[PDB]
């Protein structure tokens, strides 16, 4: 009979790191949450992935519907008039996948529409109706995702878009630190919940969609998307709650920005910009636009990283560096 050892086995309580995820809608917060699960937890099991099949189908249907309606508003004709019929069927069958089953009929409708020349002409003008950035991801792999045996891959789950109406808390561990991450997905909640969420914050991660720079101003806006993000970052960085908080800036969607800057001038977003329409200089300009909004004491600087939130290796690298920063400032 060997007496059992200690229950702590020589370990002790893990130090807590409270992270606040902030940023405009579609900036990459949910993707960062999922990447934290993939990198520092166990990823997504097969059952969890199965639970996202309905979301994948809904995202795909909603994306193609957005494109068709945008054709309506922009006066873009179908490449072939028969597609009109398909369009009608799309709206008739749009609720048929809510049980995680995409019939061959709906799959064929979506395939024919996505292949049409007018639909593609409208897609190339996505900046004019702010089409979500995962539409083509699913619509170009329709064949794979439309199989009766389809199970969403990890990358598939990463690209899904789900409602984030409140403040959601997730946990992980890394370098013996216990991370409590709070995604502020919504614009409203109870005052006491705001207080509980902003209390004792170790660090903020603020996500910015770079590729938002060329989005057309919609009727529900008073300024363009990038400037809404800048205003939010201003209100956060200079609030009493965060006078001494470590502020990290994820200038995200750098891949889409790299592709867009080739053909869309940054002056669409910043009319005063006189620099070149090239990746590095335009990226530096946006970075300075955001960093100049920090009016805290000089010791309180902003830690900026360029990210592709959907790229697991890049997020792993960037978060490895952010953890070192947090340990330093600890």
């Amino acid at each position: 009979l060997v007496p059992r050892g200690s229950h702590m086995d020589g370990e002790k309580a893990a130090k807590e790191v409270k992270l606040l995820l902030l940023g405009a809608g579609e900036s990459g917060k949910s993707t960062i949450v999922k990447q934290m699960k993939i990198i520092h937890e166990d990823g997504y099991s097969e059952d969890e992935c199965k639970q996202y099949k309905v979301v994948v189908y809904s995202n795909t249907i909603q994306s193609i519907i957005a494109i068709i309606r945008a054709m309506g508003r922009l006066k873009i004709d179908f490449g072939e008039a028969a597609r009109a019929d398909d369009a009608r069927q799309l709206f008739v069958l749009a609720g048929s996948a809510e049980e995680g089953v995409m019939t061959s009929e709906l799959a064929g409708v979506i395939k024919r529409l996505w292949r049409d020349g007018g639909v593609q002409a409208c897609f190339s003008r996505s900046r004019e109706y702010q089409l979500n950035d995962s539409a083509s991801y699913y619509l170009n792999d329709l064949d794979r995702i439309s199989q009766t045996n389809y199970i969403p891959t990890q990358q598939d789950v990463l690209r899904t878009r789900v409602k984030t109406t409140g403040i959601v808390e997730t946990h992980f561990t890394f370098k013996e630190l216990y991370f409590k991450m709070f995604d502020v997905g919504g614009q409203r909640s109870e005052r006491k919940k705001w207080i509980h969420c902003f209390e004792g914050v170790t660090a903020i991660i603020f996500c910015v969609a770079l590729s938002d720079y060329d989005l057309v101003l919609a009727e529900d806006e008073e300024m363009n998307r990038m400037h809404e993000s800048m205003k939010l970052f201003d209100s956060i960085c200079n609030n009493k709650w965060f006078t001494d908080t470590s502020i990290i800036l994820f200038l995200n969607k750098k891949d889409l920005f790299e592709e867009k800057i080739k053909r869309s001038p940054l002056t669409i977003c910043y009319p005063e910009y006189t620099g070149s329409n090239t990746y590095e200089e335009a990226a530096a300009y946006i970075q300075c636009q955001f960093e100049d909004l920090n009016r805290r004491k000089d010791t309180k600087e902003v830690y900026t990283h360029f990210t592709c939130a959907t790229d697991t290796k890049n997020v792993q690298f960037v978060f490895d560096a952010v953890t070192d920063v947090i340990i330093k400032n600890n």
Binding site: R188, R191, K192, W194
Partner: peptide, 18 residues
């Protein structure tokens, strides 16, 4: 600084916090 149960926007909360 009304009651803790009043649903409020992030902007309103940041404002009253300052």
């Amino acid at each position: 600084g009304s009651p803790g149960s009043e649903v409020v926007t992030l902007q309103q909360f940041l404002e009253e916090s300052n």
